[PDB]
Amino acid sequence: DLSFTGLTDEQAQELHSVYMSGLWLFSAVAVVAHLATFIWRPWF
Amino acid sequence: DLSFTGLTDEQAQELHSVYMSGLWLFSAVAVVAHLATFIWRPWF
Amino acid sequence: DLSFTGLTDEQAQELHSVYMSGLWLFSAVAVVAHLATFIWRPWF
Amino acid sequence: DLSFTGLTDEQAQELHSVYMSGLWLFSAVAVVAHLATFIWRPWF
Amino acid sequence: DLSFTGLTDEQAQELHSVYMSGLWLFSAVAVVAHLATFIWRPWF
Amino acid sequence: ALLSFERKYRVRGGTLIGGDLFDFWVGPFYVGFFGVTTAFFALLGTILIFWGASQQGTFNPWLINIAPPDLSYGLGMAPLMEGGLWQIITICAIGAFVSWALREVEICRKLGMGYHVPFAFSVAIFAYVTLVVFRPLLMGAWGHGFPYGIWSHLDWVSNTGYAYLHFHYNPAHMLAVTFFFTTTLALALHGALVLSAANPPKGEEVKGPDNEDTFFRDFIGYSIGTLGIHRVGLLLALNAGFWSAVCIIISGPVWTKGWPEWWNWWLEMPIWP
Amino acid sequence: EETFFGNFDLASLSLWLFYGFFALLIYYLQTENMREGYPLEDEDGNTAANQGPFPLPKEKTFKLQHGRGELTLPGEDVQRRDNLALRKTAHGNGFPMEPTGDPMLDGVGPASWSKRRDVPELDAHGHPKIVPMSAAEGFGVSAGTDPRGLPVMAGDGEIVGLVSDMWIDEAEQLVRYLELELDPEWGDGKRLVQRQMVRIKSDRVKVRSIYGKHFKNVPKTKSPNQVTLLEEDKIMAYYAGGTLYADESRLEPQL
Amino acid sequence: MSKFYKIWLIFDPRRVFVAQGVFLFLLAAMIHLVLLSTEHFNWFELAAANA
Amino acid sequence: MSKFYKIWLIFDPRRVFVAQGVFLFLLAAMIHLVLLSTEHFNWFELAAANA
Amino acid sequence: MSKFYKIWLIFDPRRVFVAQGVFLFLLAAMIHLVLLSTEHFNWFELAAANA
Amino acid sequence: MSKFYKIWLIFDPRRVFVAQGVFLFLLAAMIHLVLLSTEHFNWFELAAANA
Amino acid sequence: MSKFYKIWLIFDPRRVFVAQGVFLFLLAAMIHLVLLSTEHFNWFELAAANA
Amino acid sequence: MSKFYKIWLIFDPRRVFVAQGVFLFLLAAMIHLVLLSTEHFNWFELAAANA
Amino acid sequence: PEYQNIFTQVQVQGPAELGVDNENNLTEERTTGTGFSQLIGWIGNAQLGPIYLGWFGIISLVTGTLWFNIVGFNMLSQVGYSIPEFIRQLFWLALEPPSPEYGLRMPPLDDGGWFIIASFFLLVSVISWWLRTYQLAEMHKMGKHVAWAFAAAIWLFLVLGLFRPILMGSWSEAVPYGIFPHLDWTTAFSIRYGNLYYNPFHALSIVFLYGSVLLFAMHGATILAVTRFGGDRELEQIYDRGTASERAGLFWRWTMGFNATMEGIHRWAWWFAVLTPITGGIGILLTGTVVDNWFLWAVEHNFAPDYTQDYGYEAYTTYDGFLGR
Ligand code: BCL
Ligand code: BCL
Ligand SMILES: CC[C@H]1c2cc3[nH]c4c(c3C)C(=O)[C@H](C(=O)OC)c4c3nc(cc4[nH]c(cc(n2)[C@@H]1C)c(C(C)=O)c4C)[C@@H](C)[C@@H]3CCC(=O)OC/C=C(\C)CCC[C@H](C)CCC[C@H](C)CCCC(C)C
Ligand SMILES: CC[C@H]1c2cc3[nH]c4c(c3C)C(=O)[C@H](C(=O)OC)c4c3nc(cc4[nH]c(cc(n2)[C@@H]1C)c(C(C)=O)c4C)[C@@H](C)[C@@H]3CCC(=O)OC/C=C(\C)CCC[C@H](C)CCC[C@H](C)CCCC(C)C
Ligand SMILES: COC1=C(OC)C(=O)C(C/C=C(\C)CC/C=C(\C)CC/C=C(\C)CC/C=C(\C)CC/C=C(\C)CC/C=C(\C)CC/C=C(/C)CC/C=C(\C)CC/C=C(\C)CCC=C(C)C)=C(C)C1=O
Ligand SMILES: COC(C)(C)C(=O)C/C=C(\C)CC/C=C(\C)CC/C=C(\C)CCCC/C(C)=C/CCC(C)CC/C=C(\C)CCC=C(C)C
């Protein structure tokens, strides 16, 4: 089992779950903002 | 269990509760200020 | 066998498999973007 | 046998085989690219 | 027996025998390229 | 990530102000009260510079130019587009430099060594302040400062030098140039001597201070020593900075005519036949 | 003059070649300066997960004089201290350390010393470099004020003894140490003070770094005619630690 | 989303709080200064013009 | 894809989070500034013109 | 080749990952900027013209 | 030609791989940039003139 | 003439190979640039001339 | 003439070989450049002048 | 306050040091006789001499003296052999390079012959001094870093005096031997070929000069700061690391995020100092032979700034308003 940071497999899984949970929320907010901006002044 | 700062689960939950309580008040004040500014001079 | 980093064969196989999966995902997204861009404004 | 890097004959053979396989793949891709470019807009 | 680099007679013989093959291959490729260029656009 | 000998030096105390409120590290960097002030001032200055670049109409590093106001505005404030951003950035830069010097002071106090480095940095800060504060204040307008551009802060130097006909005839400019050249030569000689002493030809033993002393006494007939060379270099650099400041500050508010004419005192002495 | 293509001429070629050479030179210079203190460690003494973008350099050998052997770098840390009386003030990295006992007596903080060799430094002839002035033939004071015989005043205004001798550097003709004979009230024996931490006046010599009560615990030399590198380090750093640990007001914020 | 509190098992509040305190004031000051450099949203010249 | 969680066995999350935050703020600032250097998408000048 | 997984027995994954992460973003930014410096592919000016 | 595998008994592969990568990328970028500086091989200008 | 292999007993091959590579690449690039400098042997302009 | 070999009984061949190589290359390059610098002996321009 | 270690409190004097020796027998050419200066002992060492007298040193001394005497006697003869007028106009006289009409041929004595003779002598003297500095390092068993750093400046010397006039095909492209004339040559050279600010290699040389001055200031301050731990004995710190090196490294690591070693800082200093004349000579060699206008070069290469406002005083004020009428 390779580990440079000293973590365990389960710890990595539990970290990645919350990381992706936050990433999806960030992306959703960005998508809503982009949709509103495109409705305001198009670029395509 | 993964903990770099030496805190437990309950302490982290309490800290997050207080932090979110502060963040919501900051955001509400900012929203009221932005509404007043938009009524004064619109930018859209 | 030869190893300049201290790794073993199985760990290298696992790491390369995951890296390759990520590379293919990136390449697929890039391909979709290039096709859309070419449809919008063709070069060549 | 003379060796400055610490490798033995068999490991050098294996490395060179892998390196030559990668080189041939790169050369084939480059050949395809150059053929397409020459067909599109020929120099010489 | 004069030596300054630490090699023997057989090792130097083998090294030069390997080197000359690459030298001659490079020279042959260069000769073919120069002949093709001269046929394309003579400079004499 | 610490060095293998760093942990025993990482103790608490030695702060001018703040106590343990800001006493920690971020990576290799040390944070304090003045670290916070430095970060704030530097970030504000950089973001204001890029805002001005965006409003100028170019993001090219070679072509960004933020300029001081016109001479008609005097010592008052100008509109933020007609040169006020330059004043704000100047204030931010002064604050950041002072905070950097005080942070160096705090680090010196914590490590238990002398305070020579902040004192040396103070001379460069003095030269900058003379360039942007003292000379414009004496001349009567903030428009005498140089612009903040990579290639536009050389046109200012050229035009200011040619405003006195021949700036090479300034005696303080002569002194400063001589000090600069001497400092460069001394640094080259010191580095070469140390490297040659520590790196002999292959198969030879290393050397010591006696060998260096003999070498320079054989070479030129005098040796300054391993301790006097550092004093000499520090003094040369500080003198170069000080005389550069003096040369720039005497050009505008004290002398007005051309610099070659200043030598008429020598050319017209009564002793000459 | 002409251009190879577009606006590219000889000057541009020279500029780009210099760019490449400067990049390689910067790489070489940065890599050359990583022969001491690596690999990096965390605050628990273990190897850190991050080591930077510059790999470690290759080995070089120094051949030392007087038959003291050879030194190869980069290598293991032979100047490492063994048991430090320090305590972590946090569970993670990036926070200071707290002394466990007496920092001046335990050699931590600004009083830290390095584990150097326990042998004196030699000159070209193979003699000890620093020698007392009473054993150096033909040496005498030529300028300034002679400190021998003058009383010594501590950092709090206490007289502890008289200056009895000077230790000089014969090879470079420079004074290195001042020897002090202590009054029975303030201790016993003799102690050394480095020349860089004293101020010689017409009637007294003042040492502002430490107080009167800190003079009895200055490290002593084993031999009366020579001093080793380890002893110099411990004596010199003990004197430096007083700028912070001699009083409580020197450690707290000045404001 | 319900496990966001685990960030405090990664970061100590003593550094995060000061970082956020610097960041928020920097943001507010820049934004106010950027507003002050325009012609339509400068509330100092607006009062002079309106009077 | 199901094994992307093994990136944290190579990189320490504490450094990655700081680097990602700095990168995201710098990118957002650069884009918001690039939009303001044009005429079609500069909302301050558009607000000025529509009044 | 089927045996391309042995590159990780010669190189350290951490340094490679950091360098590749820097390289990809630098390349993408350079390509987007090169696109913005033309006339037929500048989308801001194309949007301005079509309005 | 069969004994060409012994080149790894002289050079350390770790150095050669990095040098080769840097050289290859620089050469590719230089050639692509040299192509753009002409007028017959600029695909951006060719696409612009073809509409 | 047949004893030319003895050169490796005088020169260290490690240094010689690196110097050879650098010199060969620089010479080839310089010759190609010099060929491009002329007006009869520039093959990029000849394609446009023949079009 | 017969005893000319005793020049190695004085000089170190290692330095002589390197100096000879560098000097020969520099001399050849300088002569080629000098020939190119004239008008009658420039063979690149002669090909164009004969076309 | 604490002692700052700028001036020595008390001096000591012992028997004079004659120097180290080996089988090369350096003693046979060294002089006998030494002195002591108490005025200089406040800063550095007090012993003066002895010096080593080889053949390169004697040749260089004699030939440089010949060059000096030639220049001085020409300047004296140019004024009518009047000593008061020679003293009065000392900073204004010179030995002028030949006229442009003579090309690379030998000019008459009135129009550049003495200039060529003196230049030949100066070249011989400088090369002799360089050979001496190489020979001394070869006989003491040391590295040759001093010779390389001198050759770095000799490169710019030769470019300014020998290589560029030959490339431009005229002996009139050299520098006159005078105090004010050489500054005049600097300014005229800058004006004649556009603006030397927009020469990139002049900018690089300026960068390295500024960096070298900054680096000596930093290193001097750092060494004087840690001198209470024996930090001025750098070689013993290199061979056996002490606390002074650790503290000096940790200061800069905590200040700017990276540091050096006791031996690696000298490599930084050597290169920053050496890189200035090399870049300067490369930049000077390209002027006129390749580029004739540097502002036009900058404009063509798109890094010359543009200005919007107008020119003239009447666009900003009035002549009567300036006078206060
Ligand atoms: C026509 C042009 C005239 C001329 C006109 C002038 C004028 C006008 C000036 C001088 C000045 C100088 N001249 Mg002159 N000069 C000429 C040509 C020459 C020649 C020559 C021909 O060889 C030489 C050798 C010099 C050299 C000099 C120096 C004596 C002096 C430079 C000041 C200095 O270094 O202060 C160095 C001090 C500083 C300003 C450093 C400031 C550093 C600050 C405090 C810190 C910076 C922090 C930074 C922002 C951090 C960000 C980086 C992060 C990593 C991101 N001149 C010609 C003849 N000269 C200048 C001078 O004396 O200035 C006082 C000056 O203004
Ligand atoms: C109007 C003036 C022009 C200008 C014209 C020039 C010209 C022309 C030149 C310089 C050059 C230089 N310029 Mg400029 N320069 C200008 C403005 C500036 C400004 C500024 C405004 O602040 C600065 C900082 C500088 C400074 C500099 C240096 C960076 C550089 C000198 C290289 C060097 O190492 O010199 C140090 C000097 C030497 C090393 C000379 C060689 C010394 C030899 C070894 C002497 C031998 C000893 C002797 C024979 C014996 C004496 C007797 C003894 C007592 C025994 N310039 C303006 C724009 N500049 C030079 C350069 O390289 O530019 C590319 C140069 O030629
Ligand atoms: C910037 C470096 C250049 C340089 C520097 C230099 N040379 C020096 C010194 C220095 C700083 C001395 O201090 C030393 C000297 O004695 O100066 C008076 C010396 C010296 N370099 C000399 C020559 C010399 N150096 C040369 C080289 C150089 N000189 C470098 C290029 C050359 C050249 C270019 O060819 C020459 C010809 C000798 C004249 C001298 C070597 C000293 C010697 O051999 O005997 C001197 C000792 C004595 C017999 C007594 C002291 C001499 C005093 C002048 C008389 C009494 C004064 C009293 C004792 C104190 C002096 C007061 C101080 C204010 C000096
Ligand atoms: C890295 C580049 C820097 C540099 C480096 C550098 N210079 C060097 C060296 C190095 C590494 C040496 O080793 C060499 C040296 O000897 O240094 C002590 C030197 C040197 N650089 C010098 C000068 C110099 N360097 C300069 C600059 C620089 N050199 C750069 C900034 C400059 C300028 C214009 O900035 C000058 C003017 C000399 C001091 C010295 C070269 C000595 C030499 O060549 O002497 C030849 C001999 C003669 C010309 C005979 C002169 C005869 C005199 C008429 C009398 C005898 C001399 C006497 C000491 C003077 C008069 C004394 C009075 C009391 C009578
Ligand atoms: C013998 O002896 C000696 C040594 O020894 C042996 C030496 O070695 C040396 C040293 C010499 C050398 C190493 C040679 C090389 C030196 C030079 C060529 C000199 C020139 C140097 C440079 C060009 C580089 C200098 C770089 C500088 C000044 C910039 C670095 C500074 C920063 C990145 C910021 C400083 C950090 C601060 C203030 C702390 C952060 C602030 C806070 C409030 C912390 C709160 C947290 C946050 C804000 C968020 C997290 C922050 C982050 C990640 C910071 C980064 C932020 C960004 C926005 C990027 C010498 C002289 C010596 O004689
Ligand atoms: C137009 O052309 C120009 C050049 C001008 C451009 O503008 C070009 C621009 C680009 C090329 C831009 C490119 C931009 C990117 C590639 C951006 C990528 C951004 C991301 C991948 C962002 C990801 C962010 C993810 C986040 C924030 C996710 C989660 C965070 C958290 C959940 C925080 C909380 C974490 C916890 C609690 C973990 C702890 C858990 C335990 C179990 C301990």
Ligand SMILES: COC(C)(C)C(=O)C/C=C(\C)CC/C=C(\C)CC/C=C(\C)CCCC/C(C)=C/CCC(C)CC/C=C(\C)CCC=C(C)C
């Ligand atoms: C338009 O273009 C330009 C470039 C000009 C711009 O202007 C660009 C602008 C941006 C890109 C702006 C971006 C802005 C952001 C991303 C802003 C983000 C802001 C936040 C996330 C703010 C968070 C604030 C949180 C707060 C205030 C929380 C709490 C505060 C408290 C005081 C609570 C304190 C907590 C305690 C005491 C807990 C103690 C508990 C224990 C158990 C001990």
Ligand SMILES: COC(C)(C)C(=O)C/C=C(\C)CC/C=C(\C)CC/C=C(\C)CCCC/C(C)=C/CCC(C)CC/C=C(\C)CCC=C(C)C
């Ligand atoms: C047109 O002319 C000019 C010059 C203007 C150009 O534009 C020229 C341009 C070029 C010459 C461009 C050339 C570009 C390239 C050659 C680009 C090459 C790019 C790549 C090879 C990219 C590869 C990316 C691969 C990635 C991202 C793969 C995977 C990543 C991950 C899976 C991330 C997660 C990692 C994990 C989980 C590690 C696994 C760990 C374990 C423990 C199992």
Ligand SMILES: COC(C)(C)C(=O)C/C=C(\C)CC/C=C(\C)CC/C=C(\C)CCCC/C(C)=C/CCC(C)CC/C=C(\C)CCC=C(C)C
């Ligand atoms: C026109 O005027 C100007 C000045 C512009 C010019 O252009 C002038 C140009 C010149 C004067 C040019 C002159 C050029 C030359 C003299 C060129 C000479 C070139 C060579 C001698 C080249 C030799 C190349 C040899 C090679 C490539 C040999 C071998 C290569 C290999 C990769 C194989 C080696 C492998 C080995 C040894 C494996 C190791 C074996 C073990 C057993 C360990």
Ligand SMILES: COC(C)(C)C(=O)C/C=C(\C)CC/C=C(\C)CC/C=C(\C)CCCC/C(C)=C/CCC(C)CC/C=C(\C)CCC=C(C)C
């Ligand atoms: C027109 O004129 C100008 C000057 C403008 C020019 O353009 C001039 C141009 C030139 C002169 C160009 C010259 C170009 C060359 C000489 C190019 C040469 C290129 C190569 C030799 C390329 C080699 C590429 C090799 C590759 C891609 C190899 C890849 C290998 C691998 C991916 C496998 C890696 C190996 C492993 C993992 C070993 C296994 C490990 C073990 C432990 C067993």
Ligand SMILES: COC(C)(C)C(=O)C/C=C(\C)CC/C=C(\C)CC/C=C(\C)CCCC/C(C)=C/CCC(C)CC/C=C(\C)CCC=C(C)C
């Ligand atoms: C016109 O005015 C101006 C200034 C322009 C001038 O141009 C003026 C020019 C001059 C004044 C020029 C003056 C020129 C001279 C005085 C020239 C003199 C030249 C010589 C004396 C040349 C001698 C050459 C000798 C040679 C080449 C000898 C070679 C010998 C060997 C190759 C044999 C080697 C011997 C060995 C190996 C001995 C081995 C024995 C053992 C025991 C080991």
Ligand SMILES: COC(C)(C)C(=O)C/C=C(\C)CC/C=C(\C)CC/C=C(\C)CCCC/C(C)=C\CCC(C)CC/C=C(\C)CCC=C(C)C
């Ligand atoms: C008569 O009264 C007495 C006896 C007291 C005197 O002797 C008085 C003497 C004086 C008052 C002398 C005063 C001297 C000066 C003021 C001198 C000033 C000198 C300079 C500023 C000199 C600068 C020299 C050189 C410069 C700036 C650059 C480059 C030069 C060179 C590379 C020179 C080398 C020349 C070569 C290689 C060409 C030689 C020609 C050949 C054909 C080989």
Ligand SMILES: [Fe+3]
């Ligand atoms: Fe030093």
